[PDB]
Amino acid sequence: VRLANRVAIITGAAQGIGRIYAERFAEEGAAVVVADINEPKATEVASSITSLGGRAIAAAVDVSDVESVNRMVDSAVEAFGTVDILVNNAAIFSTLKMKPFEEISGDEWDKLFAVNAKGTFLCCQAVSPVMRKNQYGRIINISSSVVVTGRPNYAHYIASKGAVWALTHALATEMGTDGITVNTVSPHGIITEIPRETISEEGWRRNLEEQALKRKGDASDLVGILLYLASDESKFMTGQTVALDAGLRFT
Amino acid sequence: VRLANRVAIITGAAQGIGRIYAERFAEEGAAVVVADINEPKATEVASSITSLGGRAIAAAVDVSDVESVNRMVDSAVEAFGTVDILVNNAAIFSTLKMKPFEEISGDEWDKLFAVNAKGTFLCCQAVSPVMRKNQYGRIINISSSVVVTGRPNYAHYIASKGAVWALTHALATEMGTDGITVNTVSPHGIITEIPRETISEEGWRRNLEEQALKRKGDASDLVGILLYLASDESKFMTGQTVALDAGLRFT
Amino acid sequence: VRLANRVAIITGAAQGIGRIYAERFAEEGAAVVVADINEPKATEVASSITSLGGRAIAAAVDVSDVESVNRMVDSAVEAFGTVDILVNNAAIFSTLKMKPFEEISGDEWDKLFAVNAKGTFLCCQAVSPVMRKNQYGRIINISSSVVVTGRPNYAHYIASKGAVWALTHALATEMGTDGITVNTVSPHGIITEIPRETISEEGWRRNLEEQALKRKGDASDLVGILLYLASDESKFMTGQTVALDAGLRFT
Amino acid sequence: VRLANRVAIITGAAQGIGRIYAERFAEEGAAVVVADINEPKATEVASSITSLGGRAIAAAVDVSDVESVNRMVDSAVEAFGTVDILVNNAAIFSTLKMKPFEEISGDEWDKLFAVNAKGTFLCCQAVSPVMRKNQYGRIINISSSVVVTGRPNYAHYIASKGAVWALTHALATEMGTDGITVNTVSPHGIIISEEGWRRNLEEQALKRKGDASDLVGILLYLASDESKFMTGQTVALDAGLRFT
Numbered sequence: 001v002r003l004a005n006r007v008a009i010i011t012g013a014a015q016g017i018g019r020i021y022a023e024r025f026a027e028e029g030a031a032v033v034v035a036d037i038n039e040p041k042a043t044e045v046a047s048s049i050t051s052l053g054g055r056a057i058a059a060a061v062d063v064s065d066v067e068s069v070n071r072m073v074d075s076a077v078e079a080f081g082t083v084d085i086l087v088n089n090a091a092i093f094s095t096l097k098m099k100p101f102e103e104i105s106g107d108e109w110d111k112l113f114a115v116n117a118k119g120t121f122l123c124c125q126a127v128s129p130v131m132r133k134n135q136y137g138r139i140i141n142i143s144s145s146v147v148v149t150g151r152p153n154y155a156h157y158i159a160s161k162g163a164v165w166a167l168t169h170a171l172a173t174e175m176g177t178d179g180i181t182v183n184t185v186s187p188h189g190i191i192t193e194i195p196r197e198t199i200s201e202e203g204w205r206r207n208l209e210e211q212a213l214k215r216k217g218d219a220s221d222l223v224g225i226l227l228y229l230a231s232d233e234s235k236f237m238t239g240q241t242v243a244l245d246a247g248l249r250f251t
Numbered sequence: 252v253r254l255a256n257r258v259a260i261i262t263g264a265a266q267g268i269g270r271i272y273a274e275r276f277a278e279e280g281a282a283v284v285v286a287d288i289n290e291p292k293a294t295e296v297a298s299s300i301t302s303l304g305g306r307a308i309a310a311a312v313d314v315s316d317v318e319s320v321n322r323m324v325d326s327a328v329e330a331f332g333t334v335d336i337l338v339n340n341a342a343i344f345s346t347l348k349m350k351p352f353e354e355i356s357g358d359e360w361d362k363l364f365a366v367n368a369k370g371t372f373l374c375c376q377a378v379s380p381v382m383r384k385n386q387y388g389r390i391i392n393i394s395s396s397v398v399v400t401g402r403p404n405y406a407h408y409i410a411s412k413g414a415v416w417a418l419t420h421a422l423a424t425e426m427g428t429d430g431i432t433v434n435t436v437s438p439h440g441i442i443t444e445i446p447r448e449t450i451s452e453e454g455w456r457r458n459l460e461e462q463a464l465k466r467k468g469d470a471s472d473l474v475g476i477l478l479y480l481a482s483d484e485s486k487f488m489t490g491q492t493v494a495l496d497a498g499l500r501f502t
Numbered sequence: 503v504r505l506a507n508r509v510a511i512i513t514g515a516a517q518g519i520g521r522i523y524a525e526r527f528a529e530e531g532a533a534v535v536v537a538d539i540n541e542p543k544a545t546e547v548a549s550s551i552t553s554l555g556g557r558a559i560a561a562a563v564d565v566s567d568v569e570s571v572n573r574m575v576d577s578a579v580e581a582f583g584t585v586d587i588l589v590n591n592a593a594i595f596s597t598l599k600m601k602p603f604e605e606i607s608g609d610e611w612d613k614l615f616a617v618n619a620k621g622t623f624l625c626c627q628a629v630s631p632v633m634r635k636n637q638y639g640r641i642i643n644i645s646s647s648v649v650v651t652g653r654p655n656y657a658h659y660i661a662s663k664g665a666v667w668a669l670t671h672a673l674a675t676e677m678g679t680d681g682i683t684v685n686t687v688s689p690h691g692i693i694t695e696i697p698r699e700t701i702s703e704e705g706w707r708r709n710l711e712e713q714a715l716k717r718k719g720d721a722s723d724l725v726g727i728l729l730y731l732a733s734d735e736s737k738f739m740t741g742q743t744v745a746l747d748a749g750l751r752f753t
Numbered sequence: 754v755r756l757a758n759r760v761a762i763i764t765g766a767a768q769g770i771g772r773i774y775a776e777r778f779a780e781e782g783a784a785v786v787v788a789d790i791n792e793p794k795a796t797e798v799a800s801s802i803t804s805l806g807g808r809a810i811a812a813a814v815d816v817s818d819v820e821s822v823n824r825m826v827d828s829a830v831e832a833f834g835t836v837d838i839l840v841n842n843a844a845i846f847s848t849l850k851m852k853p854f855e856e857i858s859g860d861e862w863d864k865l866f867a868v869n870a871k872g873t874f875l876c877c878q879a880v881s882p883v884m885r886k887n888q889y890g891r892i893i894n895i896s897s898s899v900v901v902t903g904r905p906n907y908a909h910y911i912a913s914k915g916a917v918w919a920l921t922h923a924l925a926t927e928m929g930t931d932g933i934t935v936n937t938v939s940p941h942g943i944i945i946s947e948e949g950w951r952r953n954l955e956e957q958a959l960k961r962k963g964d965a966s967d968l969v970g971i972l973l974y975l976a977s978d979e980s981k982f983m984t985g986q987t988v989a990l991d992a993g994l995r996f997t
């Protein structure tokens with residue numbers, strides 16, 4: 001019952017790690033808004049959660065569109081009365097083609113920033129009035145290990161997550177006046193059901209040599225820190241970045 | 252039951268935050284070794300834990316004394332069969348007199364390093380054989396926000412906690428081969444039942460101005476991250492420093 | 503003559519700190535491309551440098567426009583034969599009005615990112631061919647102390663400089679195979695740009711309270727590290743962020 | 754002439770990178786105190802510097818010994834009238850044999866800390882009065898890439914450099930009231946067989962071999978007036994082994 005009587009919006013929750021956040025948050029008592037651009041798949045996640053005794057709705061959202069984001073929050077409040085937790089998990093990543101940064105058009109740069117950076121910003125704006133009204137909130141933004149490691153062939157993705165990482169600092173200051181916390185989780189090496197071109201064979205060989213724990217990650221490696229950050233007991237932690245990376249890097 | 256069927260050694264646990272770690276860990280099902288330089292007072296904490304339904308023993312330890320440390324770990328294994336968790340909380344801190352660094356004698360410097368840095372090192376050496384044997388361990392070292400903020404008049408304390416901070420990185424690498432994780436918690440501004448001259452009134456005005464969350468801290472602000480780090484679910488996190496500081500600094 | 507027989511492009515160089523970079527790089531022997539949206543004002547700066555014995559041309563550039571950026575690099579190579587150094591100083595900051603992040607429109611966010619983040623990215627792309635061909639390059643990107651401190655009322659600016667900060671890491675990896683270094687300078691926000699009016703004494707005392715070094719800062723304080731990062735003295739440094747902040751924060 | 758009319762103490766300066774710091778500082782106009790446990794070898798460095806037209810003296814110092822450290826600063830002020838710059842380069846490292854941390858005795862830990870951490874502390878104490886009186890100081894402490902990377906088999910060395918790293922922050926605060934700056938340089942630990950170079954290059958962003966010239970530039974920056982607004986920072990010279 002780690003999240004009993006709390007309401008969480010998770011963007012990008014129709015698949016991958018965000019789906020696991022939604023399922024586990026609902027197992028821990030949260031009423032979950034499964035928010036995704038893919039409404040049928042988000043409905044499949046929410047229906048799976050409800051059929052197991054949890055509370056969940058699906059909400060279609062384009063996080064790059066301000067009125068879609070506002071409608072998503074409206075749907076959360078209409079269903080569950082409030083929003084306690086926002087996890088800004090939606091991102092363009094799995095669909096990326098690896099390419100040298102010279103080959104990234106300005107259009108591809110902008111389109112990825114619109115979801116990854118602007119979209120996180122817009123969602124934070126949309127939950128701000130409800131969290132300030134209740135003088136309570138947990139915002140969890142999502143960066144990536146590649147921000148610190150600067151891995152090749154994803155330079156726009158890396159820059160967009162750098163924007164999210166810095167945004168957390170600004171929002172922790174501005175929203176902390178109402179007790180709201182804002183933190184960043186930086187995952188590394190998490191394998192899900194969604195295939196991706198992110199890490200190659202030579203890329204995993206390098207990662208395992210650099211990691212302190214010599215293994216790949218999975219979703220269960222992230223759920224714990226998300227539960228901590230979303231829960232009442234993280235009340236004193238804000239403006240921090242927490243890396244879940246098997247010691248790929250040290251802090 | 253966050254720590255069910257786990258055994259935790261907490262040094263410096265006869266008072267202050269370490270006593271709260273012991274009490275809360277035991278409430279979550281851990282068998283706790285209340286280790287401290289005051290054996291009767293550590294016995295008082297352990298007796299209180301057992302009178303509430305918890306599993307706990309007390310152990311006298313001078314963490315600067317390798318033989319004393321070795322007997323502490325032997326006592327833990329004798330009582331509870333293993334050690335799963337080590338919290339290196341013992342430090343010279345609340346007793347410190349503040350002074351400009353030119354006024355710190357070499358003997359003052361050495362005595363503080365013997366407890367804070369060497370003492371943490373010796374405890375990690377002593378639990379290494381049992382954690383490697385069982386291919387499992389959670390080591391939590393304790394630094395301090397003053398390592399990053401460089402507050403005045405405690406230069407030897409700051410340097411000793413910088414040694415702990417770096418030591419965590421070396422140990423994460425060397426012990427991760429057997430799955431053991433090693434992380435650092437960096438508290439700030441936690442008020443306990445023990446008075447201390449570490450922060451003045453003008454110092455708190457400065458801290459509250461710099462913090463994102465405008466309040467002082469207490470022990471409940473720290474227990475949650477210690478439970479996460481000591482628990483099975485932090486398995487993918489190693490070599491990290493987690494600051495609990497109300498946003499005094501950002502990461 | 504620390505930059506003798508080197509060619510340097512500086513964006514946003516018609517006024518403020520960028521002009522000082524241009525003037526000081528030229529004094530140290532660099533051929534300087536004074537790149538700015540204001541071609542007449544940039545030509546004035548170039549004329550001032552040349553009449554004092556330096557080598558400089560002006561180039562009009564809209565760093566958010568890929569074709570304008572490409573034309574700037576062509577002008578540099580056509581005039582001086584190569585590009586050795588790129589300083590991505592162009593940024594929207596002085597014109598910004600303080601506003602809480604909820605009041606920043608998506609369009610305002612996008613317009614600032616187009617210059618601050620995308621603009622730096624486009625310029626790095628445009629110099630990449632000439633630097634790779636010559637197996638030599640020094641790229642200096644610019645962040646700000648507000649990223650680490652999370653100053654309020656500039657959330658989009660902060661996020662855009664987080665994007666630049668992370669982008670430096672990606673570019674250091676991708677360009678370091680050809681002997682090109684990429685680093686970030688983070689000036690104290692108070693010296694981020696030349697103020698229009700002199701900082702009042704009361705304002706200086708508020709700033710000094712946060713500094714470890716109790717001294718007032720100015721533009722000469724950034725020139726030294728830029729000269730280091732643009733010169734062969736930094737040939738082994740890449741992917742780093744260097745903060746010039748009188749110890750406002752520590753690293 | 755970037756260090757013209759300045760006086761620099763460099764500990765551990767009779768050999769290795771410390772000797773190169775001293776030589777290059779003297780070339781840039783500094784009056785150099787070549788300080789080392791090996792006074793004969795340090796005298797050879799000072800005489801080498803002097804015969805090339807620079808100003809230098811040798812001072813024997815055991816940086817773990819407060820009386821020896823005080824005699825070193827007195828010798829510097831006796832020769833040159835002041836101390837502007839202190840580079841705390843003395844460290845136990847090259848002699849170290851790799852061993853898992855379980856095998857490091859408490860005595861080995863203490864002996865290494867006495868030089869690497871306490872020694873830096875004592876030298877900073879000893880230059881404090883002259884630097885505060887003159888309202889001027891550049892202190893450069895030395896860490897290592899192994900602190901951030903957590904390389905195996907050097908745990909006490911790593912911890913001792915973490916102590917130095919944090920100490921710089923405390924001293925930047927306490928000495929910055931008098932216009933003194935305190936910063937840390939973190940060199941790549943590698944500064945070797947070709948196979949070893951290639952293993953090291955694999956981890957670097959910049960695919961170039963490093964040497965001592967790669968550290969002199971940042972030391973000159975941090976010892977000079979060009980860094981007068983920088984304090985409490987750690988500057989890594991590591992070819993992008995890590996990013997910051």
Ligand SMILES: NC(=O)c1ccc[n+]([C@@H]2O[C@H](COP(=O)([O-])OP(=O)(O)OC[C@H]3O[C@@H](n4cnc5c(N)ncnc54)[C@H](O)[C@@H]3O)[C@@H](O)[C@H]2O)c1
Nearest residue numbers: 012014015016017037063090091094144187188189190194
């Ligand atoms: N609303 C929109 O406009 C929009 C746009 C694109 C994608 N999305 C949604 O987002 C989801 C994308 O899922 P996915 O499989 O692509 O990504 P995912 O399941 O791996 O999501 C992971 C999140 O963590 C970050 N991350 C970085 N490194 C990681 C690591 N090693 N492990 C885990 N997370 C890491 C990712 O950038 C992302 O923010 C989908 O449901 C999709 O519909 C939404």
Ligand SMILES: NC(=O)c1ccc[n+]([C@@H]2O[C@H](COP(=O)([O-])OP(=O)(O)OC[C@H]3O[C@@H](n4cnc5c(N)ncnc54)[C@H](O)[C@@H]3O)[C@@H](O)[C@H]2O)c1
Nearest residue numbers: 263266267268313314340341342345393395438439440441
């Ligand atoms: N040789 C030994 O075994 C030994 C030596 C000295 C002390 N100790 C024991 O350790 C305990 C010390 O308790 P205490 O009251 O001095 O410390 P505390 O309970 O206030 O703090 C415990 C730990 O948190 C760290 N810390 C960092 N930031 C802090 C903050 N904001 N507030 C509080 N602590 C912060 C301390 O350095 C220490 O490692 C006592 O039980 C004492 O007997 C043991």
